[PDB]
PDB file of C-alpha atoms and ligand atoms in Angstrom:
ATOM      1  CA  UNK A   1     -14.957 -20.098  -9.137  1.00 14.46           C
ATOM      2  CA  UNK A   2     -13.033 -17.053  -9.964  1.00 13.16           C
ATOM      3  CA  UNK A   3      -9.238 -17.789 -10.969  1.00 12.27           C
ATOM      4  CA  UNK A   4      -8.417 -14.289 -10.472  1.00 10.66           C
ATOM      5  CA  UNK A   5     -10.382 -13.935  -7.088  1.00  7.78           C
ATOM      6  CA  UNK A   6      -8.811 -17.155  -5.522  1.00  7.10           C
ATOM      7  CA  UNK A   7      -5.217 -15.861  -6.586  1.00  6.95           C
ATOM      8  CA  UNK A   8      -5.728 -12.726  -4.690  1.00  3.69           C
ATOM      9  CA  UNK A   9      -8.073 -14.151  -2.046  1.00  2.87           C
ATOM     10  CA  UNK A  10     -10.359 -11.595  -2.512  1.00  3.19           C
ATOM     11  CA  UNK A  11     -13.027 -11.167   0.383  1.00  2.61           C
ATOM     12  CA  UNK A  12     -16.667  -9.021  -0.527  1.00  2.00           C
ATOM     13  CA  UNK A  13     -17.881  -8.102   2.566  1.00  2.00           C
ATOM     14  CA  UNK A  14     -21.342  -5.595   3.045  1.00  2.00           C
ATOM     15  CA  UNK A  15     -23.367  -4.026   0.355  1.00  2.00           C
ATOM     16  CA  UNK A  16     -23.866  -0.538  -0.851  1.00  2.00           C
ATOM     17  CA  UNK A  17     -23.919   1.405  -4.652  1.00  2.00           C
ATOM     18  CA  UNK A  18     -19.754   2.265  -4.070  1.00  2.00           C
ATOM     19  CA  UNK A  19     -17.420   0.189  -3.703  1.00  2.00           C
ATOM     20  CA  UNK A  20     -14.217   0.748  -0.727  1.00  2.00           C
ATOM     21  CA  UNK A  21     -11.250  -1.441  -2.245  1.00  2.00           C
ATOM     22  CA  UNK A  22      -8.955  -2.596   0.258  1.00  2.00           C
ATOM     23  CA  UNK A  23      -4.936  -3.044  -0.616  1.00  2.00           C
ATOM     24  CA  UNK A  24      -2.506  -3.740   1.958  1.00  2.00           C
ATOM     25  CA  UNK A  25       1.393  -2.861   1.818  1.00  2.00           C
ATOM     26  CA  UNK A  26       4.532  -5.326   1.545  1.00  2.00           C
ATOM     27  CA  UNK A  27       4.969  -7.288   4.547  1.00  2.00           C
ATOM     28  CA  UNK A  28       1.376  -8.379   5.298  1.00  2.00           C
ATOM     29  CA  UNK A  29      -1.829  -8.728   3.655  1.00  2.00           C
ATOM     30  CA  UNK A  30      -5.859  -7.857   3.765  1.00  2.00           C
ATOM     31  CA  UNK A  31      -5.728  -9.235   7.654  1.00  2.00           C
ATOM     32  CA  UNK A  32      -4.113  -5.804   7.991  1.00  2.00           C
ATOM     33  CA  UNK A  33      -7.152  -3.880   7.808  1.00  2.00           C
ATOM     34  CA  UNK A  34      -9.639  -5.725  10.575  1.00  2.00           C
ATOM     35  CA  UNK A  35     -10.260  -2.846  12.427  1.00  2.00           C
ATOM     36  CA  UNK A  36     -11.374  -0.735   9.583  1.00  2.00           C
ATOM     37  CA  UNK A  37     -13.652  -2.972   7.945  1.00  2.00           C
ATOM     38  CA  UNK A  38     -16.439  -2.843  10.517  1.00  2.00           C
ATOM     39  CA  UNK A  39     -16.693   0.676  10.405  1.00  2.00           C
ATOM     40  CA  UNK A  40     -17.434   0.328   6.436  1.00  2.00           C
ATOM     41  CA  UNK A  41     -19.671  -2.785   5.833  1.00  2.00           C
ATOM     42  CA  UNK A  42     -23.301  -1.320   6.870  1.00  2.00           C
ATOM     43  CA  UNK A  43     -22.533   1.851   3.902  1.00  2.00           C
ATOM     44  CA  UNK A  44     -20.153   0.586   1.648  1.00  2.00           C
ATOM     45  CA  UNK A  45     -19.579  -2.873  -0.589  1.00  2.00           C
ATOM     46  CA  UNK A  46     -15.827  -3.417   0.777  1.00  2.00           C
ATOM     47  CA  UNK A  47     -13.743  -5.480  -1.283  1.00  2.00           C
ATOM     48  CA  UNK A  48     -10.309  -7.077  -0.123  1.00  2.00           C
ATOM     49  CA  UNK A  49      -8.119  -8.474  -1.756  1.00  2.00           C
ATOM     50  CA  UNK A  50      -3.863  -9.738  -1.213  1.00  2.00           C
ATOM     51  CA  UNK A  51      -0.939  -8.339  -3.092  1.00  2.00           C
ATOM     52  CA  UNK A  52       0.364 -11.639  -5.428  1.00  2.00           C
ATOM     53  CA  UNK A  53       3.715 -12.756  -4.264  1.00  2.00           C
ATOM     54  CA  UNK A  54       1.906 -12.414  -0.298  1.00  2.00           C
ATOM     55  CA  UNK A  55       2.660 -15.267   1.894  1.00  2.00           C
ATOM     56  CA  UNK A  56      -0.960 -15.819   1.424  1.00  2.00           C
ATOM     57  CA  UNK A  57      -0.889 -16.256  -2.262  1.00  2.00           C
ATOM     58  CA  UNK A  58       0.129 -19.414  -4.561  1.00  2.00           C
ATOM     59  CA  UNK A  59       3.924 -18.709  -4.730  1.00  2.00           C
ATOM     60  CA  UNK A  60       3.691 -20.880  -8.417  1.00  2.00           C
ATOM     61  CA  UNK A  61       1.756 -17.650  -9.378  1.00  2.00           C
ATOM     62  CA  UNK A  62       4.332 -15.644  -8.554  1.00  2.00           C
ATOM     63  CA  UNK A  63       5.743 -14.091 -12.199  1.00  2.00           C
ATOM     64  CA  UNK A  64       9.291 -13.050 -11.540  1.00  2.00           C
ATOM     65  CA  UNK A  65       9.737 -11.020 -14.479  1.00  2.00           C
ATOM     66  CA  UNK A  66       5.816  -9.348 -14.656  1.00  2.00           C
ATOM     67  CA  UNK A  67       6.091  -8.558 -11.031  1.00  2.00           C
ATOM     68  CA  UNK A  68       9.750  -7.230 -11.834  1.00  2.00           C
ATOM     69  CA  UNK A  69       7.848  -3.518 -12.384  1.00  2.00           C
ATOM     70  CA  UNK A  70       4.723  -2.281 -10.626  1.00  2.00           C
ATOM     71  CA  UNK A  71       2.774  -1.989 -13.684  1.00  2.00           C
ATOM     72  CA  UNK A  72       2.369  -5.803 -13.348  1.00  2.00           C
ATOM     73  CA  UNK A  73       0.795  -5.266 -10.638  1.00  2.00           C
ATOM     74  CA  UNK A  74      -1.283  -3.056 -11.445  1.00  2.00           C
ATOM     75  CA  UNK A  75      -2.888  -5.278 -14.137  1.00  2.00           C
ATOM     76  CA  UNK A  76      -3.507  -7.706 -11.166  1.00  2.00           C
ATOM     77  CA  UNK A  77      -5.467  -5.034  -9.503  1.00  2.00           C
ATOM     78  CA  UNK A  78      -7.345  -4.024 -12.357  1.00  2.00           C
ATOM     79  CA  UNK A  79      -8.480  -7.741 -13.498  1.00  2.00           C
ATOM     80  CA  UNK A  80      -9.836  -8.166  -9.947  1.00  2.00           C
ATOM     81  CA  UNK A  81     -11.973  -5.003 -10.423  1.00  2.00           C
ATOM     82  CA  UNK A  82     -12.874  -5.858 -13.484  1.00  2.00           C
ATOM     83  CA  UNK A  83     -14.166  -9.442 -12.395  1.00  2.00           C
ATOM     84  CA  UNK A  84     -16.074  -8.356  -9.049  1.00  2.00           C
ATOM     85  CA  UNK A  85     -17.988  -5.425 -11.723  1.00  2.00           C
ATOM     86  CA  UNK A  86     -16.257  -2.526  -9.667  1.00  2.00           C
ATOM     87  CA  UNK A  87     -16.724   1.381 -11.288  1.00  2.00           C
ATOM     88  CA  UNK A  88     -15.607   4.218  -9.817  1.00  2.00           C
ATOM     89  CA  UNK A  89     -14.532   2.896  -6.532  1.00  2.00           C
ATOM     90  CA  UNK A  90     -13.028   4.021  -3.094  1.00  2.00           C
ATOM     91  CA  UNK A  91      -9.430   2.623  -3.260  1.00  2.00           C
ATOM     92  CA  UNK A  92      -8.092   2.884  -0.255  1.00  2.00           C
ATOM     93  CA  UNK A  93      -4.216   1.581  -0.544  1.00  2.00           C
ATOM     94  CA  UNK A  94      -1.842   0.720   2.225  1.00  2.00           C
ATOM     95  CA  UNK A  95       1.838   1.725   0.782  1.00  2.00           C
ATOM     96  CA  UNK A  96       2.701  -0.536  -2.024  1.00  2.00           C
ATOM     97  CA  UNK A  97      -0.989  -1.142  -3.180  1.00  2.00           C
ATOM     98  CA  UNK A  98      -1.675   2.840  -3.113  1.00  2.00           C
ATOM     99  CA  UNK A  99       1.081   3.301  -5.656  1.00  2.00           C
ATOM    100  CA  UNK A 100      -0.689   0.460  -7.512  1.00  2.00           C
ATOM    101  CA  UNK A 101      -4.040   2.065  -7.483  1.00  2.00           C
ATOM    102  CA  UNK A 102      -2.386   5.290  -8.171  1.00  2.00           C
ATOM    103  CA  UNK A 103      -0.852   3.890 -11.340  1.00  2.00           C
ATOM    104  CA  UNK A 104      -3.777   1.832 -12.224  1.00  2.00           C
ATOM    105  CA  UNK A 105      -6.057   5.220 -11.983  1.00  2.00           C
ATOM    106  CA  UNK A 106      -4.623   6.763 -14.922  1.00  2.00           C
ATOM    107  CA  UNK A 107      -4.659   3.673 -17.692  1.00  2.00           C
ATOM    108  CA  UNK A 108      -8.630   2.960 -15.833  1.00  2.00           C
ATOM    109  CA  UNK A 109     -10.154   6.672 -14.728  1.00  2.00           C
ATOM    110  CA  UNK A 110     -13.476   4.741 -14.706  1.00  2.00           C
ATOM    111  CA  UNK A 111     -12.482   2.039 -12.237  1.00  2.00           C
ATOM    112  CA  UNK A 112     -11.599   4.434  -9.402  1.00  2.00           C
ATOM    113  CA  UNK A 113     -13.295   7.728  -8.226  1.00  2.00           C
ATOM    114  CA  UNK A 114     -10.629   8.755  -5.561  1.00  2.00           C
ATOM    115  CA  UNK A 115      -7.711   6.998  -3.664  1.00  2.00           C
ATOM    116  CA  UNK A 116      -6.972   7.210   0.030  1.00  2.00           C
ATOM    117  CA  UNK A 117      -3.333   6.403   0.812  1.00  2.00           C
ATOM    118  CA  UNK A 118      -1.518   5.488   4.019  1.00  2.00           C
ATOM    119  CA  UNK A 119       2.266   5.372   4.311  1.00  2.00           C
ATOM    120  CA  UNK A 120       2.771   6.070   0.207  1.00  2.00           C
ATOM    121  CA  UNK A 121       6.214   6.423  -1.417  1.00  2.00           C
ATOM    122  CA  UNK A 122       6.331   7.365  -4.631  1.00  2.00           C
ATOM    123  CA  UNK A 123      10.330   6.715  -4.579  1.00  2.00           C
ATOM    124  CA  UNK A 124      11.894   4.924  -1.286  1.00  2.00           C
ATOM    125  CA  UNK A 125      15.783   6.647  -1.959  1.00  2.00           C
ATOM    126  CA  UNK A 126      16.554  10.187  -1.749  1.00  2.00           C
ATOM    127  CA  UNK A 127      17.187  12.543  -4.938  1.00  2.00           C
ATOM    128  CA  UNK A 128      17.676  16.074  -5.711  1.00  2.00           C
ATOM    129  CA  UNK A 129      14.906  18.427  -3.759  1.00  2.00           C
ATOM    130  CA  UNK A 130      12.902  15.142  -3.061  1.00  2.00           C
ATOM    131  CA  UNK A 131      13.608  13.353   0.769  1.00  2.00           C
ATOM    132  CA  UNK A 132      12.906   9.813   0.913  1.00  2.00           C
ATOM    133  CA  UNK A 133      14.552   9.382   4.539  1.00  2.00           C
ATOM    134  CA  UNK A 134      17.144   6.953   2.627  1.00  2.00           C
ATOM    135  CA  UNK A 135      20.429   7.688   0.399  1.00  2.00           C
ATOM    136  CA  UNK A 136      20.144   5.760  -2.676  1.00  2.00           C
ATOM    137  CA  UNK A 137      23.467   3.878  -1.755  1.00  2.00           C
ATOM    138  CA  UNK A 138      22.251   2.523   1.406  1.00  2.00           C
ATOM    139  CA  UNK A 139      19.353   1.419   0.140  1.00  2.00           C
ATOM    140  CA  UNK A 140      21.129  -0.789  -2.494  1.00  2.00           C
ATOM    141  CA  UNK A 141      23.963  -2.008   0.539  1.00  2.00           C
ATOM    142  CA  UNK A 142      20.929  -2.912   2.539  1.00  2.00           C
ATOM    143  CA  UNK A 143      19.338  -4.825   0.164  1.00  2.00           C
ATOM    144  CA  UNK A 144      22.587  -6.693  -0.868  1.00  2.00           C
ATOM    145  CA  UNK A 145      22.372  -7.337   2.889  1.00  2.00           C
ATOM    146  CA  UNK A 146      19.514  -8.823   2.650  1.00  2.00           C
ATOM    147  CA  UNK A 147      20.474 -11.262   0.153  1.00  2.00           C
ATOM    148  CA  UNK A 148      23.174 -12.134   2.215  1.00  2.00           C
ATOM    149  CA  UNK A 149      21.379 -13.012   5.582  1.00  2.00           C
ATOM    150  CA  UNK A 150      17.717 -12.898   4.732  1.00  2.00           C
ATOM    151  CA  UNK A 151      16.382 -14.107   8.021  1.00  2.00           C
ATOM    152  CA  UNK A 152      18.879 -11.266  10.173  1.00  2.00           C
ATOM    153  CA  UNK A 153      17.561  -8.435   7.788  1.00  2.00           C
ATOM    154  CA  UNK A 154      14.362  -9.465   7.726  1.00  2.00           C
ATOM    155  CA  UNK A 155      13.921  -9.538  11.756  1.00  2.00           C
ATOM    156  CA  UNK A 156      15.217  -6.526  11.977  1.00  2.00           C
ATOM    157  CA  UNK A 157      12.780  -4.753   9.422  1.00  2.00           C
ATOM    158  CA  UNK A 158       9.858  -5.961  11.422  1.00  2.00           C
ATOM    159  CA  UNK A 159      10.340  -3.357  14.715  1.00  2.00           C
ATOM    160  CA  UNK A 160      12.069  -0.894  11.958  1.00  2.00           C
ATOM    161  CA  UNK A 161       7.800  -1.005  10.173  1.00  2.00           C
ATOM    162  CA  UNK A 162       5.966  -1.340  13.204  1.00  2.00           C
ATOM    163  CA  UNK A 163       7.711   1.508  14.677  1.00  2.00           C
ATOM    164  CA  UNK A 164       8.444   2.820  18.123  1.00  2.00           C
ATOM    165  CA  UNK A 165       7.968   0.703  21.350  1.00  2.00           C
ATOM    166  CA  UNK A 166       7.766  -2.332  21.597  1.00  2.00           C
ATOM    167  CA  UNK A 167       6.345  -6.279  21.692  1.00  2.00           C
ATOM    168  CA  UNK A 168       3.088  -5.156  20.755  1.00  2.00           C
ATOM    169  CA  UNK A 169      -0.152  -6.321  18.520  1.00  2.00           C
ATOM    170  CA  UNK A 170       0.887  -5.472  15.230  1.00  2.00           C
ATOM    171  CA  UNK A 171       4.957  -6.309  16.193  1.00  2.00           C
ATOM    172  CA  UNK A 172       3.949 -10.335  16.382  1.00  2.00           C
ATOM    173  CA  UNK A 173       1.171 -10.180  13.656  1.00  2.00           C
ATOM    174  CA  UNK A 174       3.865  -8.517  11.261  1.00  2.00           C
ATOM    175  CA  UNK A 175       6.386 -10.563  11.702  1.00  2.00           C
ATOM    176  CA  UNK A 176       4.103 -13.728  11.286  1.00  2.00           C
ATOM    177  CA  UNK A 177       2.989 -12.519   7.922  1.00  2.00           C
ATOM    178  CA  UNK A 178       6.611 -11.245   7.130  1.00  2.00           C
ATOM    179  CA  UNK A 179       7.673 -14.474   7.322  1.00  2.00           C
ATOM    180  CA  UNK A 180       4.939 -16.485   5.506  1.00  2.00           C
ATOM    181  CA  UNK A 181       6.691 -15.106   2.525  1.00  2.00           C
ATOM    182  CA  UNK A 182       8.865 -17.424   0.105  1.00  2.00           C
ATOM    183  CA  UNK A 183      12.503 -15.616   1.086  1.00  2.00           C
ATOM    184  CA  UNK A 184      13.471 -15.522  -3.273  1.00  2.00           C
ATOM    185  CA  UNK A 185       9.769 -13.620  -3.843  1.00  2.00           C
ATOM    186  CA  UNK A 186      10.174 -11.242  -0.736  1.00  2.00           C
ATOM    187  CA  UNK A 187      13.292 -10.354  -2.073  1.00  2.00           C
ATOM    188  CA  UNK A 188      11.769 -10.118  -5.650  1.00  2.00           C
ATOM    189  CA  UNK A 189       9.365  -7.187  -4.397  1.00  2.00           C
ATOM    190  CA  UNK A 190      11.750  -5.330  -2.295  1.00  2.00           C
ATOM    191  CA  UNK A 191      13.655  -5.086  -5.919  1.00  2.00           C
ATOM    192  CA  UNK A 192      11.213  -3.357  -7.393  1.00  2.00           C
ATOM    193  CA  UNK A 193       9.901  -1.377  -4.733  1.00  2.00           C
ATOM    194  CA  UNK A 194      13.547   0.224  -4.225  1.00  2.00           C
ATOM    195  CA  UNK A 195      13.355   0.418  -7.473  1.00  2.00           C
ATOM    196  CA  UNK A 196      10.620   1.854  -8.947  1.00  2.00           C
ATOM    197  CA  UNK A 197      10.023   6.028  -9.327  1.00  2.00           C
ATOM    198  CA  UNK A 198       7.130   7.594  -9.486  1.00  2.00           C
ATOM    199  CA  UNK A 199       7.819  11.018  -9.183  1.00  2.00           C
ATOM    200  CA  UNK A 200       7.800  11.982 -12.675  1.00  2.00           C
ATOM    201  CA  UNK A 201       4.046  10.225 -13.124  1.00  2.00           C
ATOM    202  CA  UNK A 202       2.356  12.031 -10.286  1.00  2.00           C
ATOM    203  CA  UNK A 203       0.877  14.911 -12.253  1.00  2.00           C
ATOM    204  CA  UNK A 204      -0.624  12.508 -14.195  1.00  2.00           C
ATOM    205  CA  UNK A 205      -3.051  10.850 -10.761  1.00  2.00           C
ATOM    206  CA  UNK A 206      -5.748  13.277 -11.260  1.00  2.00           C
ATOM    207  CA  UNK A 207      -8.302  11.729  -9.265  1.00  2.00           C
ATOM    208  CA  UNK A 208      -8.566  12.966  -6.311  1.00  2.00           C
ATOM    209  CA  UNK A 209      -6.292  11.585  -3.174  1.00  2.00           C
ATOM    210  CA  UNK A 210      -6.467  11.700   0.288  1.00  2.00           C
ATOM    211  CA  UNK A 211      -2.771  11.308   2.014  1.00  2.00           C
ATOM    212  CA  UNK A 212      -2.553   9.757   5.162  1.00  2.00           C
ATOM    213  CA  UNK A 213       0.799   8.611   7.127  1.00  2.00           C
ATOM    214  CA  UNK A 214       2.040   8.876  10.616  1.00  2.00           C
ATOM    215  CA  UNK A 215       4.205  11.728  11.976  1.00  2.00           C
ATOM    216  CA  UNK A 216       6.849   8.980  12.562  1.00  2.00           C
ATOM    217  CA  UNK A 217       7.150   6.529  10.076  1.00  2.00           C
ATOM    218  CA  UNK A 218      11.228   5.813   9.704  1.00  2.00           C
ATOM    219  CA  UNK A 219       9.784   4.410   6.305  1.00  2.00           C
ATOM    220  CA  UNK A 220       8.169   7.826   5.421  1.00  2.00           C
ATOM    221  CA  UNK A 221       8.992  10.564   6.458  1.00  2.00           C
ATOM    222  CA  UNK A 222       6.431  13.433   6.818  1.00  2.00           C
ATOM    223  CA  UNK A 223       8.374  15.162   3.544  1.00  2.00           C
ATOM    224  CA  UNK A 224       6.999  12.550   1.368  1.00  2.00           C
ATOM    225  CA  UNK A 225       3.590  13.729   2.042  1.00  2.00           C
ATOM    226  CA  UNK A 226       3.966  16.963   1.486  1.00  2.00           C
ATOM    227  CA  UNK A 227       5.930  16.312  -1.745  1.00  2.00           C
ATOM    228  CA  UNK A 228       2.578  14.004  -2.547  1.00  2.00           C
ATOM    229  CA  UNK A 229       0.583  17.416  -1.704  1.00  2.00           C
ATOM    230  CA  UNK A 230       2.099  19.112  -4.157  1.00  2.00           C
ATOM    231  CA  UNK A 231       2.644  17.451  -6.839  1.00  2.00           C
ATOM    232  CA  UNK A 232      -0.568  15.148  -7.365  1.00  2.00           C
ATOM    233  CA  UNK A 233      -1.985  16.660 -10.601  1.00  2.00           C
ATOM    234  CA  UNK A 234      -5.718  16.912  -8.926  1.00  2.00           C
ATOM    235  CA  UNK A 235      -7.268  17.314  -5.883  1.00  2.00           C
ATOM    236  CA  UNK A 236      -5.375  16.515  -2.377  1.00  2.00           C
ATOM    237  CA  UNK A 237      -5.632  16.642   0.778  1.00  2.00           C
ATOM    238  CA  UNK A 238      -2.980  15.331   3.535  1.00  2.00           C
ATOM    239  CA  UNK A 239      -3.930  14.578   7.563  1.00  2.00           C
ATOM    240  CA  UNK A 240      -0.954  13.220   9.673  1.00  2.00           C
ATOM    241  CA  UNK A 241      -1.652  10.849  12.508  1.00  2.00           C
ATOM    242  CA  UNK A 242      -0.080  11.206  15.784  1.00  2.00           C
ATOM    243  CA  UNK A 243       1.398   7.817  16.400  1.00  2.00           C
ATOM    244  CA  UNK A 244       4.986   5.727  15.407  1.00  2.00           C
ATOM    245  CA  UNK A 245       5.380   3.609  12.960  1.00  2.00           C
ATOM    246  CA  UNK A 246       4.276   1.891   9.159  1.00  2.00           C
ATOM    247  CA  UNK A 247       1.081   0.582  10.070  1.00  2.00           C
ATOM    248  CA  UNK A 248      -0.758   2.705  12.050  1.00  2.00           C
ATOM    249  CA  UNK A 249      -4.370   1.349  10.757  1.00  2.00           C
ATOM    250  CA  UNK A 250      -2.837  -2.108  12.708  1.00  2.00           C
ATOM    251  CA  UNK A 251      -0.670  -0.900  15.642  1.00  2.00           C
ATOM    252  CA  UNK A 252      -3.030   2.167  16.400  1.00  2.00           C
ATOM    253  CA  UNK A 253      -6.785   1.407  15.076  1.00  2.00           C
ATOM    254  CA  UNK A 254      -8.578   3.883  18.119  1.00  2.00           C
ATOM    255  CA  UNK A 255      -6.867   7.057  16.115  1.00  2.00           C
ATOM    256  CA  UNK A 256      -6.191   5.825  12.631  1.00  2.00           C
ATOM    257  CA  UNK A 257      -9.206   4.309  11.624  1.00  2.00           C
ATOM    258  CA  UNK A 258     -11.606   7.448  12.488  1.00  2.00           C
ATOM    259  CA  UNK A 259      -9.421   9.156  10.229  1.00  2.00           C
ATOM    260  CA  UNK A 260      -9.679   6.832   7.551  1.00  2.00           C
ATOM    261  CA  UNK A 261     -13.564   6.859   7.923  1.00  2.00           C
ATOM    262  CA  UNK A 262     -13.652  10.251   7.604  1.00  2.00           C
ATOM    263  CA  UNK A 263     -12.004  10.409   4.774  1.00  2.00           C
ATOM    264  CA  UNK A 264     -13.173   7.599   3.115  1.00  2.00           C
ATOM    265  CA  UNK A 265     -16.605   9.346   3.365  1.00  2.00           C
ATOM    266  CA  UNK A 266     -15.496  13.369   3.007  1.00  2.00           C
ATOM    267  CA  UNK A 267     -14.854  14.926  -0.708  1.00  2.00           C
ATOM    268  CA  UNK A 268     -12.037  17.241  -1.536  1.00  2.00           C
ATOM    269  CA  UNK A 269     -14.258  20.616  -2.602  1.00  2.00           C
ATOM    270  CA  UNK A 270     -13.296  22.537  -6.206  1.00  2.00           C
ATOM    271  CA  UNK A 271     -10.316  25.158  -6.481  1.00  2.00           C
TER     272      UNK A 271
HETATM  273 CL1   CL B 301       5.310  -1.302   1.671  1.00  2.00          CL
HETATM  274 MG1   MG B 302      -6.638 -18.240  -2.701  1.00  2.00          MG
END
């Protein structure tokens, strides 16, 4: 019945008094985070739901000009906790929707508790004494690029996210959701992504977060988490996982996801 819960597809799965929200990063959607959901269902109410403008969503939807800054997102996100009765949840964000959650924490402190984050970039280009692994020129020559041959760029990013070697699981299932996105709205995000800076917001997050990427992500480099670390205005707490790549909860579930579950279920102590 829900017009906001069919937009976002959202998917309630388990039961339990806290809720673990589930938001998945540009490129794919909430199929991203199968292996993790069984390990959550028998404790926790999980929620799931896909970014708009994902090759799963109603492309008609798709705002141009709200989802032109990630504070329109961010609304999204907080209508769909407001409709499913969510309080003080478990958001646990994959890229994009972490800075989402992130952002939405501080206009909503009493829809989120804490936020766990894997592969977050607060900014994607590099600046003075912060390292995004990208000079803010290439960055805007690659996505002129990617205007320019859409299809080239595009099958190129999917090994560039996955990460390492080779034709794997998450390679294929990637590329099939990569793909499943309207080529104008794909290109709409990636604007704003590139785009957007968080950097000066950060001490505002107070909640606390838990910081998770892999030790090679060409998207993130381990910098970013460390510049996360210390400049999150609460509690944090950062665990790198030993694996290649963007989506390590996909393309390397056996070492990834008992570090989600543990923290998912751990608290940052006081001091
Ligand atoms: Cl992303
Ligand atoms: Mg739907």
């Amino acid at each position: 019945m829900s017009t906001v819960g069919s937009a976002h597809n959202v998917t309630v799965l388990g039961s339990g008094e806290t809720t673990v929200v589930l938001g998945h990063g540009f490129g794919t959607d909430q199929s991203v985070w199968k292996y993790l959901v069984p390990h959550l269902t028998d404790d926790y109410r999980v929620l799931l739901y896909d970014n708009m403008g994902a090759g799963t969503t109603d492309p008609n939807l798709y705002d141009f000009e709200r989802y032109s800054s990630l504070e329109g997102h961010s609304q999204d996100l907080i209508a769909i906790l407001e409709e499913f009765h969510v309080t003080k949840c478990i958001f646990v964000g994959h890229s994009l929707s972490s800075m989402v959650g992130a952002v939405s924490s501080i206009f909503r402190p009493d829809l989120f508790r804490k936020i766990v984050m894997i592969s977050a970039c607060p900014r994607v280009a590099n600046a003075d004494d912060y390292y995004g692994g990208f000079e803010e020129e290439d960055v805007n020559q690659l996505y002129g690029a990617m205007e320019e041959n859409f299809q080239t760029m595009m099958t190129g990013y999917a090994p560039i996210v996955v990460g390492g070697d080779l034709e794997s699981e998450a390679m294929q299932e990637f590329s099939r959701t990569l793909f499943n996105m309207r080529p104008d709205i794909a290109l709409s995000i990636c604007r704003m992504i590139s785009g957007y800076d968080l950097r000066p917001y950060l001490g505002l997050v107070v909640i606390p977060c838990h910081i998770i990427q892999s030790s090679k992500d060409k998207l993130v480099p381990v910098a970013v988490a460390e510049y996360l670390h210390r400049n999150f205005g609460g509690k944090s707490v950062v665990e790198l996982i030993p694996t290649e790549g963007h989506l390590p909860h996909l393309s390397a579930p056996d070492i990834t996801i008992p570090v989600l579950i543990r923290h998912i279920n751990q608290d940052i102590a006081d001091d």
